[PDB]
């Protein structure tokens, strides 16, 4: 199937408490592989997946250089955002950045991304064509014009269609055991009386990778979102994911209810029913 590489960066100002904190984190699909934290002693980009330890030592020096340049740049971008929004130096603010590339199962470039958020709101994003920018407000329109004038879309396109995909494909090979695995969910159903009169049926998907999954309830084979609870997909901490979906049911009518599990690792959707 398709694969994604994503770098996520967070810069947080803390006036009177030193320079902003910069955290960067790198992912391939739902698996983290690097970090950098300007507060940590190493002052190095660090591995967070076994397979990235195969990169040579030159890699660690190069990524450390570049993430430090990102750092110094987003520290200044916090001060530029202050000016544009006309805000005091007394308050803490957040600049988030995301970028990276998608490839098909053939390994060909699919899609490129490069976007910012200020104080948790969309600021600017590179559009699908990788030739143009969406700006959320007049401050981002200042950035949009600067970046058009300086051909920023062209520099970022050449990275996303080039080095980015090269990197993602090398990672997919060096970490094939991890990244290209497909762990189907292990599913079961639990039953929890609420009363003499009603019970919760809970449908479980455990140990699955990657994290994309769909859990659906039906009653007599028609979709059910009434009395349905669906929790966020959640990490187990071992590189796999968990999810459940629940219905409260008239006790003695359990068998009307089917749970349906869709996941890349199942050759076919699963139907679960209540089995004493």
């Amino acid at each position: 199937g398709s694969h994604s590489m994503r770098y996520f960066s967070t810069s947080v100002s803390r006036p009177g408490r030193g320079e902003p904190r910069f955290i960067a984190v790198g992912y391939v699909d739902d698996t983290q592989f690097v970090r950098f934290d300007s507060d940590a002693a190493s002052q190095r980009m660090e591995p967070r997946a076994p397979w990235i330890e195969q990169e040579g030592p030159e890699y660690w020096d190069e990524e450390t250089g570049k993430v430090k340049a990102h750092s110094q740049t987003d520290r200044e971008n916090l001060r530029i955002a202050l000016r544009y929004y006309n805000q005091s130096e007394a308050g803490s603010h957040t600049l988030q950045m995301m970028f990276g590339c998608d490839v098909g199962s053939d390994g060909r470039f699919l899609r490129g991304y490069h976007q910012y958020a200020y104080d948790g709101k969309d600021y600017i994003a590179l559009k699908e064509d990788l030739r143009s920018w969406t700006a959320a407000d007049m401050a981002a329109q200042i950035t949009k014009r600067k970046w058009e004038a300086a051909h920023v879309a062209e520099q970022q396109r050449a990275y996303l269609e080039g080095t980015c995909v090269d990197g993602l494909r090398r990672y997919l090979e060096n970490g094939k055991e991890t990244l290209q695995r497909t762990d189907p969910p292990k599913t079961h159903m639990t039953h929890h009386p609420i009363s003499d009169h009603e019970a919760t049926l809970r449908c479980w998907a455990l140990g699955f990778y990657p994290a994309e999954i769909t859990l659906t309830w039906q009653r007599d084979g028609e979709d059910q979102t009434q009395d349905t609870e669906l929790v966020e997909t959640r990490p187990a901490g071992d590189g796999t994911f968990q999810k459940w979906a629940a219905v409260v049911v008239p006790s003695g009518e359990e068998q009307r209810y089917t749970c349906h599990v869709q996941h890349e690792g199942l050759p076919k959707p699963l139907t679960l029913r209540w089995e004493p």
């Binding site: 890699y59 990102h70 987003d74 544009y84 200042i142 600067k146 090269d166 990197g167």
Partner: peptide, 9 residues
């Protein structure tokens, strides 16, 4: 693998 250039707002 990171890019070399990071733009100013």
């Amino acid at each position: 693998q990171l890019p070399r250039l990071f733009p100013l707002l």
